[PDB]
């Protein structure tokens, strides 16, 4: 069994796949803390988890002239000044299950918790590439490709790429992280090294990093070319042409209600509604609107968190709104967020439906009842 | 009459205000060409148009140490290498009229044409500031403030600001433009000099530019502080607090149908539906979906234009879709666009309603009938 060596996990996780392991924290704990504990941070694995001997581990980075720089874990820690970045990773498939309600889709049936937040520590990718000899700027459209140590039966490794400008930008905060919430990277989260690409879909933050290469093209890997793309609601498996849509990089504005949970019976008097909101590309969440009547009337929730610099809001905003609720009533709780570029979320899922079940960002609706 | 000196305009414009002059091109011409002719380019004036003697004109730019650089029009043309940028300006109030249908709002009642596109030529703001002695990077949060030569009765000039980083970035393409579609700036469009801020709301592209200043704060002007902001649908004139929302800079994804026009009777057989789509922040439009049945089913339109570099899609994408239409039917034509960060447009206007009638980006719907 290829998965016998996988790490043990926290028992309260909502698991949608055991082999390979894919799980999310319970929604009731998801937004309990700003930084998601390492043991509850959602886990998305395409393959068996690599077992890595730290001292023999080498990160390979190809230089400008075709040479190869080879770095040990000790050297990655000692050569480059450690930088810390608090960033939220959201999977493209977050909230896929709401989409399947409209019309079945193929994919892991995530609820609202394929998102988590951590303070990451590591070398900046930028410094590693400047050390390998690359310039701050290359002419034209270049990409940085990453391969992981995890590989499918045929030997193809998990891989992804990001544009060269993002990799070299001081402000974009791309890390080759070896620490997570103050401790070393857990195995499920990429030990000993993963890429963390703030403001970008989870798929590009390659775990168990074995190689870094600069190329005039995007990663040729199946997951960069033939997956993690958004299509029209009309497209299906027989018509999809992956050349017609760009690989998902930055993600759009998103939010969900984490408390209360669907089907809850809540006591009359006061109700504290809670959730998260986040947007891609370093775009801050500037407002979260909450409705208790199915989206007819709205109130403004309180945003928690502390501001980040402009263009660098990599971490989610937790929100709450305490409201009066009358005995014997039925509530349809809805939330929608607005970002710093005034992007907003769409009313419904059908018009944004797609065959892969990705980019599920229509309003989250939670129906509960108020007891007598 | 303070407006006696205003320039004459093209007679086919859709004028919503004569004094001050505010007008949009006819929707049937709006998307006829990629570059909007200067005579049809929408015009948004808050005040009387300044009459400027070109030779006595001086642009004032305050240096880092409190000194003032003063530039003539000849020097702006000769000192700095001319750069050309094709960019779309969209007013915050575009499509306000659709919002008033839900609940009356105060503001010029724009239809879908408070947007236009031109190739602008001028000095880069960046070069002008480096020439004034500023560094490429200032520590902290700095702004570049612009004042126009147009001033209200009390003597306050039109003014706005953009973040310092945007002004100094080579990629952001901010210009001090003296040319428009190959000719000198028309008076209504800022002669002799205007700022053009690509990917940003029209309000910041200050016309009839008299001054440029760097400040640790945003423009103190009324239009930067107490206008061009987005609020919750619940906010009204008695509750609005302009300190609670950020000034609009980048705009969200937008699109409209320009052909056919509402109420049209179209011949059976084939119908060519046309429109525009654009997104802020240099984010390319990656897809436009079109429905003929009120948003139940969708097809993908053809995008016209030529690609721009990543992060620099400053100009709109014109689209078209030729479709079969059966005699005696009723169509509800709808369009929605998706940008490079997979941001999308919301189904309806009510949930995005606000007191100023700004940020009107819900799906545009056009009802027509097919003859027999
Ligand atoms: N090598 C490796 N990198 C990987 C993956 C993987 O299967 N292999 N999954 C990716 C995707 S789709 C997701 S959403 C994130 C999830 O990171 P997490 O498990 O630490 O939450 O890691 C990405 N990096
Ligand atoms: N000085 C000056 N700058 C100005 C304005 C104005 O009233 N005064 N209007 C602003 C706003 S709200 C808009 S939408 C754009 C419109 O530019 P246009 O008239 O060339 O289309 O210019 C901006 N710049
Ligand atoms: Cl998934
Ligand atoms: Cl307006
Ligand atoms: Mo993912
Ligand atoms: Mo405007």
The answer to whether the Cβ–Cβ distance between B234 and A141 falls below 8 Å is: no
Nearest beta carbon to residue A351 from set B248, B287, B336: B336
Pairing type for strands A143-151 and A157-163 reads: antiparallel
**Probe ligand 1: pick from A202, A210, A251, max atoms within 8 Å of CB?**
A202
Length of chain B: 372
Cβ–Cβ < 8 Å for A353, A101: no
Q: Is A222 annotated as a binding residue?
A: no
C-alpha A322/C-alpha A266 separation (Å) is 13
* Rounded CA separation B204/B187 (Å): 18
Distance of CA B123 to the CA centre of its chain: 20
Q: What are the Cα distances from residue B253, in Å, to A288, B46, B166, B347?
A: 19, 25, 20, 13
Cβ distance B279 to B301 under 8 Å? Answer: no
Longest dimension (CA), chain A: 74
R_g of chain B, CA atoms, integer Å:
21
- Dihedral over Cα of A358, A247, B315, A312: its sign: positive
CA proximity to B311, closest of B169, B195, B118: B169
What span, in angstroms and rounded, lies between the C-alpha atoms of A319 and A289? 10
Residue with tokens 């109700």: A271
Host H or E run for residue A288: strand A285-291
> In this structure, how many other beta carbons lie within 10 angstroms of the beta carbon of residue A51?
12
Q: Where are the beta strands (DSSP E) in A63-164?
A: 68-72, 83-90, 115-124, 143-151, 157-163
CB-side neighbour CA atoms (13 Å) of A114: 27
Exposed, middle or buried: residue B231 (CB in 10 Å: 0-12, 13-18, 19+)? buried
DSSP A234: T
Q: Is A75 helix (H, G, I), strand (E, B) or coil?
A: helix
Resolution in A: 2.2
| Dihedral sign of CA atoms A37, A39, A43, A45 in order | positive
Instruction: Indicate the pairing of strand B299-300 with strand A58-62.
Output: unpaired
Contact A230, A359 (CB under 8 A): yes
- Dihedrals φ, ψ of B200, to 5°? -130, 155
Q: What backbone phi and psi angles, to 5 degrees, belong to B161? A: -145, 160
- CA–CA separation, B100 vs B349, rounded Å? 10
Asked if A232 and B347 come within 8 Å (Cβ–Cβ), the reply is no
Collapsing DSSP states into helix, strand and coil, what is residue A126? helix
- What is the residue with the minimal CA distance to atom 10 of ligand 1? A203
Query: Which helix or strand (DSSP H or E) is residue A22 part of?
Result: strand A22-24
Separation between Cα atoms, residue B133 and residue B212, nearest integer Å: 13
CA B338, B343, B347, B350 torsion-angle sign: negative
Site to substitute for ligand 1 among A30, A43, A45, most atoms within 8 A of C-beta: A45
B8 exposure class (CB count in 10 Å sphere: 0-12, 13-18, 19+) = exposed
Experimental technique, in short, is X-ray
Whole-number Å distance between alpha carbons of B279 and B277: 7
**Closest CB from B250, B342, B344 relative to A341:** B250
> Rounded CA gap, A206 and A150, in Å?
10
The tokens of B29 are what?
């011409």
C-alpha B115 to ligand 4 mean position (Å): 11
**Strands of the sheet with A364-370, listed across from one edge:** A265-266, A364-370, A330-339, A285-291, A299-300
Q: Shortest CA distance to A36 belongs to which of A172, A177, A189?
A: A189
Residue B290 in contact with residue B273, Cβ under 8 Å? yes
Alpha-carbon dihedral sign for residues A234, A99, A251, A341: positive
DSSP string, A159-222: EEEEEHHHHH-STT--EEEEEETTEEPPGGGTTT-EEE-TTB-GGGS-SSEEEEEEESS---SH
Distance CA A30, CA A111 (A): 11
Cα of B222 from ligand 4 centre, angstroms: 14
Is B55 annotated as contributing to ligand binding? no
CA B45 – CA A200 distance, rounded (Å): 39
Preferred mutation among A295, A296, A342 to probe B, highest tally of B CBs within 10 A: A342
CA distances from A137 to A141, A174, B199, B238 (A): 10, 16, 23, 51
Which of B250, B338, B372 has the alpha carbon at shortest distance from A229? B338
Hey, what's the torsion of the CAs at A42, A44, A48, A52, to 10 degrees? -60
Q: Using an 8 Å Cβ cutoff, are B292 and B332 in contact?
A: yes
d(CA B116, CA B14) in angstroms, rounded, equals: 14
Enumerate long-range contacts of B134-140, CB under 8 Å, 24 or more apart.
B134/B63, B134/B64, B134/B168, B134/B214, B135/B64, B136/B168, B137/B165, B137/B168, B138/B164, B138/B214, B140/B216
Look at residues A46, A112, A53, A67 and name the one whose alpha carbon lies nearest to residue A259. Answer: A112
Which one of B299, B332, B343 makes the best mutation probe of the A interface by having the most chain A beta carbons within 10 Å? Answer: B343
- A62, HSE (Cβ side, Cα atoms, 13 Å): 13
**d(C-alpha B159, C-alpha B206), whole Å:** 7
Nearest CA in chain A to B343: A252
Q: Are B86 and B336 in contact (CB under 8 A)?
A: no
Residues B282/B334, Cβ–Cβ less than 8 Å: no
- Both tokens of B309, joined, read 């570099």
Spatial distance between the Cα atoms of B54 and B319, rounded to a whole number of angstroms: 40
- Phi/psi for A210 (5° steps) reads -110, -35
**Contact of B8 with B25, CB cutoff 8 Å:** no
Q: Which residues pair with A331 in a beta bridge?
A: A368
Q: Which residues of B touch A (CB under 8 A)?
A: 141, 163, 165, 230, 232-234, 245-246, 248-253, 280-281, 286-287, 289, 295, 297-300, 309-311, 336, 338, 340-348, 351-352, 359, 361
CB B188 within 8 A of CB B21: yes
Q: Which two tokens stand for residue A228?
A: 């993690």
Token couple for A217: 């093209």
Residue A30's contacts (CB-CB under 8 Å, 6 or more residues apart) are: A24, A36, A40, A112, A113, A115, A116, A258, A276
What is chain A's alpha carbon radius of gyration, rounded to the nearest angstrom? 21
Tell me the chain A residues in contact with residue B346 when contact means C-beta distances shorter than 8 Å. 344-347
Rounded distance, CA A41 to CA B108, Å?
49
Burial label, A257 (beta-carbon count in 10 A; 0-12, 13-18, 19+): buried
CA B142 to centroid of chain Cα atoms: 23
Class of residue A279 by CB neighbours under 10 A (exposed 0-12, middle 13-18, buried 19+): buried
Sequence-ordered list of residues with C-beta below 8 angstroms from that of A91, at least 6 positions apart, any chain = A42, A44, A110, A114, A115, A201, A202, A203
Distances (CA, A) of B152 to B14, B15, B45, B149: 25, 21, 12, 10
| Token pair recorded at residue B260 | 């056919």
The tokens for B160 are: 């706005």
List b or e across A145-173, with b for residues whose CB sees 16 or more CB atoms inside 10 angstroms. Answer: bbbbbbbeeeeebbbbbbbbbbbbeeebb
Cα distance between residue A358 and residue A353, in whole Å: 8
Helix (H, G, I), strand (E, B) or coil at A15: strand
What CA–CA distance (Å, rounded) separates B266 from B327? 9
Pairing of strands A58-62, A209-215: parallel
Distance, in Å, from the CA atom of B28 to the CA atom of B38, rounded to the nearest integer, reads 16
What string of H, E and C letters represents the secondary structure of chain B? CCCCCCCCCCCCCEEEECCCCEEECCHHHHCCCCCCCCCCCCEECCCCCCCCCCCCCEEEEECCCCCEEEEEHHHHHHHCCCEEEEEEEECCCCCHHHHHHHCCCCCCCCCCCCEEEEEEEEEEHHHHHHHCCCCCCCCCCCEEEEEEEEECCCCCEEEEEEEHHHHHCCCCCCEEEEEECCEECCHHHCCCCEEECCCECHHHCCCCEEEEEEECCCCCCHHHHCCCECCCCCCCCCCCCHHHCCECCECCCEEEEEECCCCCEECCEEEEEEEEEECCCCCCEEEEEEECECCCCCEECEEECCCCCCCCCCCCEEEEEEEEECCCCEEEEEEEEEECCCCECCCCCHHHCCCCCCCCCCCEEEEEEECC
Q: What is the DSSP secondary-structure string of A290-314?
A: EESBSSSS-EEPEEES----TT---
Cα gap A251→A205, rounded to integer Å = 13
Secondary structure class of A122 (helix, strand, coil): strand
Nearest-CA residue for atom 5 of ligand 1: A45
Pairing of strands B254-259, B265-266: unpaired
At A15, list the tokens.
Answer: 């698991």
Euclidean distance between the first and the last CA atom of chain B, given in angstroms as a whole number:
54
Place of tokens 């240096």: B63
Burial class (CB in 10 A: 0-12, 13-18, 19+), A238: exposed
Decide: helix, strand or coil at residue A282.
coil
Identify the structural domains of chain A with CATH numbers, from first to last: 1-249 (3.90.420.10), 250-372 (2.60.40.650)
In this structure, chain A runs to a length of 372
Cβ(A66)–Cβ(A133) under 8 Å? no
Shortest alpha-carbon distance between residue B341 and chain A (Å):
5
Residue B222 CA, chain-centre distance (Å), reads 19
Q: Before A20, cis peptide (omega within 30)? A: yes
Contacting residues of A for B287, CB less than 8 Å apart = 232, 245
CA–CA gap between residue B346 and residue B351 (Å, rounded) = 9
Residue B307: CB atoms within 10 A of its CB come to 9
CA distance A61 to A206: 14
DSSP class of residue A7 equals: P
Of the candidates B273, B286, B265, the one whose C-alpha atom is nearest the C-alpha of residue B333 is B273
Helix (H, G, I), strand (E, B) or coil at A242: helix
For an interface test with B, give the residue of A138, A344, A345 to mutate (most B CBs within 10 A): A344
Shortest Cα–Cα distance, B249 to chain A (Å): 7
Strands A299-300 and A43-44, sheet pairing: unpaired
Pocket lining: A45 vs ligand 1, CB cutoff 6 Å: yes
Quick one: tokens of A59?
Answer: 């990160």
Residue A301 has a CB neighbour count (10 Å cut-off) of 25
Summary count for chain A: helices (H), strands (E): 6, 22
């Amino acid at each position: 069994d290829p998965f016998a060596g996988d790490p043990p996990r926290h028992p309260g996780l909502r698991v949608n796949s055991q082999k390979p392991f894919n799980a999310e924290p319970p929604a009731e704990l998801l937004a309990e803390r700003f930084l998601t504990p390492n043991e509850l941070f959602f886990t998305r694995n395409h393959l068996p988890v690599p077992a890595v001997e730290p001292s023999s581990y080498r990160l390979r980075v190809d230089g400008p002239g075709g040479g190869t720089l080879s770095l040990s874990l000790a050297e990655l820690r000692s050569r480059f000044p450690k930088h810390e970045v608090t960033a939220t990773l959201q999977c493209a498939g977050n909230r896929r299950s709401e989409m399947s309600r409209v019309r079945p889709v193929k994919g892991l049936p995530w609820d609202i918790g394929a998102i988590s937040t951590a303070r990451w520590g590591g070398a900046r990718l930028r410094d590693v590439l400047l050390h390998a000899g690359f310039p701050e700027e290359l002419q034209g459209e270049w990409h940085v490709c990453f391969e992981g140590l995890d590989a499918d039966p045929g030997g193809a490794p998990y891989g992804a790429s990001i544009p060269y400008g993002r990799a070299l930008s001081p402000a974009a905060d791309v890390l080759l992280a070896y620490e997570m919430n103050g401790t070393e990277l857990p195995r499920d989260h990429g030990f000993p090294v993963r890429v963390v690409v703030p403001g970008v879909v989870g798929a590009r933050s390659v775990k168990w990093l074995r190689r870094v290469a600069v190329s005039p093209d995007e990663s040729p890997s199946h997951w960069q070319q033939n997956d993690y793309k958004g299509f029209s609601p009309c497209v299906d498996w027989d018509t999809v042409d992956y050349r017609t849509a760009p690989a998902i990089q930055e993600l759009p504005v998103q939010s969900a209600v984490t408390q209360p949970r669907p089907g809850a019976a809540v006591p009359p008097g006061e109700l504290t509604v809670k959730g998260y909101a986040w947007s891609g590309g370093g775009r801050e969440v500037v407002r979260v609107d909450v409705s208790l009547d199915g989206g007819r009337t709205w109130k403004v929730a309180r945003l928690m968190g502390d501001k980040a610099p402009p263009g660098r809001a990599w971490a989610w905003a937790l929100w709450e709104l305490t409201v009066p609720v009358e005995a014997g009533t039925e509530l349809e709780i809805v939330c929608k967020a607005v970002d710093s570029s005034y992007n907003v979320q769409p009313d419904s899922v059908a018009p944004i439906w797609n065959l892969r079940g990705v980019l599920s960002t229509a309003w989250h609706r939670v129906r509960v009842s108020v007891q007598d």
